[PDB]
């Protein structure tokens, strides 16, 4: 705290309480007693625990029928109107679309829709696999997920 | 029909004014004006000028005959206290209070 390290009054003789610093955390505009620092909240997850969780939640999405498997899922031109038409034909609104390739027209056509997210099969995460209502996997992306996860 | 007049921020203590305001509560205004005329307090000058304003507001703004009017409610509230520093001996300072008031006079028929 910007201040001075001088006693606001002497120790005794005056009728007031003892005080040593105006920077005291009991004063107005004093310090915070246990003032915080920039800290890192990242936790370690074991590799086998991360894969156990993914193999668990993909088993649960299968048992809950929240997993859709198609051979290919492409949009010809990078248009969100075309993607919204295709998802309306699939009866999908809130969906994660994992694809084993880099489709730029699909990324751009899915970038503006907040109900829709498009990932690579490598860039999948458990919180997305839970937060989305349906998950569409390319059969190749299934083959890649099965290969990473044995 | 009630008619209100107020002298807010009356430069006087509320305790000093409530002594005068308690003399004319419930009285006819011709008697209250005679009491305030022959009362020697400064607050009688204040509350008389307020009672005269309430009478003129009741006659002009509300249509009322003066002989039937009667002081039904009168009360003094504490105002903002401007505060000054008065020096005492041995460098000690005392913070005096310079009280104000809010005089309110309600005059009516009923």
């Amino acid at each position: 705290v910007t201040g001075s390290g001088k006693k606001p009054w002497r120790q005794k003789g005056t009728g007031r309480a003892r005080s040593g610093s105006i920077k005291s955390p009991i004063w107005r505009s004093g310090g915070v007693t246990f003032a915080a620092r920039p800290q890192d909240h990242s936790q370690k997850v074991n590799k086998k625990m991360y894969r156990g969780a993914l193999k668990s939640i993909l088993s649960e999405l299968v048992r809950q029928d929240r997993l859709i498997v198609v051979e290919k899922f492409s949009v010809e031109a990078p248009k969100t109107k075309l993607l919204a038409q295709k998802l309306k034909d699939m009866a999908l609104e809130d969906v994660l679309i994992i694809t084993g390739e880099l489709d730029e027209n699909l990324f751009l056509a899915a970038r503006n829709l907040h109900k829709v997210d498009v990932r690579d099969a490598t860039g999948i995460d458990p919180v997305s696999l839970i937060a989305f209502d349906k998950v569409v996997m390319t059969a190749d992306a299934v083959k890649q997920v099965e290969e990473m996860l044995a | 029909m009630e008619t209100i007049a107020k002298h807010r921020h009356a430069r006087s203590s509320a305790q000093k004014v409530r002594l005068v305001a308690d003399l004319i509560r419930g009285k006819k205004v011709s008697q209250a004006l005679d009491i305030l005329t022959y009362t020697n307090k400064k607050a009688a000058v204040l509350v008389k000028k307020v009672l005269e304003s309430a009478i003129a507001n009741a006659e002009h703004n509300d249509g009322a005959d003066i002989d039937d009017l009667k002081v039904t409610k009168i009360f003094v509230d504490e105002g903002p206290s401007m505060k000054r520093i008065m020096p005492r001996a041995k460098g000690r300072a005392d913070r005096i209070l310079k009280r104000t008031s809010h005089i309110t006079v309600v005059v009516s028929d009923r």
Partner: peptide, 27 residues
């Protein structure tokens, strides 16, 4: 109105006016 200097450091007691009103009888 710019009316500070009331209880700032209470110099009131920084005066620390001599105490011990000739009572060194409590020895």
């Amino acid at each position: 109105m710019s009316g500070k200097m009331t209880g700032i450091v209470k110099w009131f007691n920084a005066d620390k006016g001599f105490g011990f009103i000739t009572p060194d009888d409590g020895s």
